[PDB]
Design a protein around this ligand. Structure first.
Ligand SMILES: *C/C=C(\C)c1ccc(-c2ccccc2)s1
Length: 133
């Protein structure tokens, strides 16, 4: 299934600190951020997505259309300019962000009642699991 709609509460977070290090996030931010539980809110209608990632420490929102490239500034995360593109590989939603960092982007897919996420940058992969609230 491609239905990623919902409010998703984190269950598991693996190697988030490694992914942040690959993005060059400063020590202070990483040490706080790695402690925190995350929430993902996805609104999905056809190709049109609104995605919000939140903790007590950050709020990161992005809107996009599947299949349409968009220039984006990564704002409070690492303040970099990338060219982003989100597409379907089967029922895996795949984002590639072209720019200074290699292998940058993410993957999201559904397994039963849970949403699985990969965050990639450089040679780092962060693996996450969320349950549907
Ligand atoms: C689909 C998942 C996305 C877009 C994100 C998951 C964590 C993100 C993030 C942004 C800023 C600061 C920390 C984490 S975005």
């Amino acid at each position: 299934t491609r239905d990623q709609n919902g409010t998703w509460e984190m269950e598991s977070n693996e190697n988030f600190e490694g992914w942040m290090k690959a993005l060059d996030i400063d020590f202070a931010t990483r040490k706080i951020a790695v402690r925190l539980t995350q929430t993902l809110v996805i609104d999905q209608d056809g190709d049109n997505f609104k995605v919000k990632s939140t903790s007590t420490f950050w709020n990161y929102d992005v809107d996009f259309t599947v299949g349409v490239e968009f220039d984006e500034y990564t704002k409070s995360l690492d303040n970099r300019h990338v060219k982003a593109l989100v597409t379907w590989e089967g029922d895996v939603l795949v984002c590639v962000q072209k720019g200074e960092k290699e292998n940058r982007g993410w993957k999201k897919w559904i397994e039963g009642d849970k949403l699985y996420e990969e965050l990639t940058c450089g040679d780092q992969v962060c693996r996450q699991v969320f349950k549907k609230k």
